[PDB]
Design a protein around this ligand. Sequence first.
Ligand SMILES: Nc1ncnc2c1ncn2[C@@H]1O[C@H](COP(=O)(O)OP(=O)(O)OP(=O)(O)O)[C@@H](O)[C@H]1O
Ligand SMILES: [Mg+2]
Ligand SMILES: [Mg+2]
Lengths: 342, 20
Amino acid sequence: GNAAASVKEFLAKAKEDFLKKWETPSQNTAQLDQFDRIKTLGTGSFGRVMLVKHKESGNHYAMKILDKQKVVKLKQIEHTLNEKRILQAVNFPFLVKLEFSFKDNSNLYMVMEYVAGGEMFSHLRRIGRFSEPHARFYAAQIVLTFEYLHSLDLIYRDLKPENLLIDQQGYIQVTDFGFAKRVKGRTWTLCGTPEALAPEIILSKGYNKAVDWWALGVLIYEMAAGYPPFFADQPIQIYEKIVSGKVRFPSHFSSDLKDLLRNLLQVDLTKRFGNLKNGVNDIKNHKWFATTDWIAIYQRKVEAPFIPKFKGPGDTSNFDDYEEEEIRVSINEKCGKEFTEF
Amino acid sequence: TTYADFIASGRTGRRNAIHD
Ligand SMILES: Nc1ncnc2c1ncn2[C@@H]1O[C@H](COP(=O)(O)OP(=O)(O)OP(=O)(O)O)[C@@H](O)[C@H]1O
Ligand SMILES: [Mg+2]
Ligand SMILES: [Mg+2]
């Protein structure tokens, strides 16, 4: 996301900027034959993201390809429209930039900045766990990003290391807006990733942006422990644990970290941090963040825990290898009406 | 250990979203 150029004033301008783009989204800003597709960077439950080279500029990008028929099969039409409409409208240092979008007969395409440092996930699993200062550095960026997104009436709904990328300065970029939604009241969809679901999602109650603050508790736990607070071999066993909501902490967790996590991983919405009278400030002013200079994080002035190794603009060494598949495009348009606004 | 139990589990790799 673009680098930094009162907080109430900042957020007011940010909302004006967002709403102009929300109300009149960008469409059709590239086409498939403007890019050479090189290699898959990642797949998720819905799309495939490829490293591509834009021919006329020589620039590399990360192209998310969604098969329209798969989107329909998995009941993701509205979610995918949400994803693109929101991502084209947002602007924050720790959000991946959508550079182009377009569609063809078969697929939807979201061409992002290529964030070359890899998923946080891979680094996390390899090293085992992050130190508290390292975890805190990443967590601060998510706190600020959620303050931004929630101010726009957005809920993010898929926070996990697989959807967080490390950039060339060692800062985070959030990707995968697939479950992001602009909502002023509560919402009901069962979506996310099992380990990160708040209890109120699992219990079908109706929920709001507090589920993102829960998920931040899960992320901070997982970064600092190396495993999630609620794990099992199958999702249903995870849900039981979440709803039990007893949390146990590693021996090495600081008292401050445990206290913060008890307040984020809080089943009682009247007590969950992020969800109280003082909003995000209960988190920012928590003892675990006492060392965090919030403005310096926003300005990317804090020294990063590590800068990924980068050997040229098309280097993918920080990403796992994936099986490749042909990108088919039918001579017949699929799902034209459904995706008219994309 | 909790770590050993996690590592021996089936969910140490990249996790899929759930929906529907
Ligand atoms: N801008 C990017 N630069 C580099 N790699 C990226 C970028 N965006 C996404 N990726 C990679 O592609 C993967 C899939 O992208 P994304 O998470 O958006 O797909 P998805 O199908 O919606 O995944 P999910 O199962 O979480 O819903 C990411 O986990 C990451 O490895
Ligand atoms: Mg994803
Ligand atoms: Mg997704």
